[PDB]
Curated annotation (Swiss-Prot), chain A:
Protein purpose: Flagellin is the subunit protein which polymerizes to form the filaments of bacterial flagella.
Protein name: Flagellin
Family, similarity comment: Belongs to the bacterial flagellin family.
Domain of life, per lineage: Bacteria
Organism of derivation: Escherichia coli (strain K12)
Location in or out of the cell: Secreted; Bacterial flagellum
Swiss-Prot record, chain B:
Protein's UniProt name: Flagellin
Organism: Escherichia coli (strain K12)
Subcellular location per the Swiss-Prot or TrEMBL entry: Secreted; Bacterial flagellum
Main function: Flagellin is the subunit protein which polymerizes to form the filaments of bacterial flagella.
Family: Belongs to the bacterial flagellin family.
Length: 27, 50
């Protein structure tokens, strides 16, 4: 029938959305 | 006897008319079968499209 769905979720995984934006270990 | 002859000829002709009526329904029913099959395939496609 209609409306018979299983929902798959997708999360944006990248440096910006992981806290690793600007990750440096030197000056 | 003369009245009987009218019934014999009348009923015999009437049975011929009844045979025509059966043919009309069969021809109409036959076309509906392909319409049903086309609808069945369309239903399958919508399941694949949604």
């Amino acid at each position: 029938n209609d409306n018979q769905t299983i929902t798959i979720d997708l999360k944006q995984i990248d440096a910006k959305t992981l806290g690793l934006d600007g990750f440096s270990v030197k000056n | 006897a003369n009245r009987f002859t009218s019934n014999i000829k009348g009923l015999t002709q009437a049975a011929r008319n009844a045979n025509d009526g059966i043919s009309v329904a069969q021809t109409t029913e036959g076309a509906l079968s392909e319409i049903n099959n086309n609808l069945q395939r369309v239903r399958e496609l919508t399941v694949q499209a949604t």
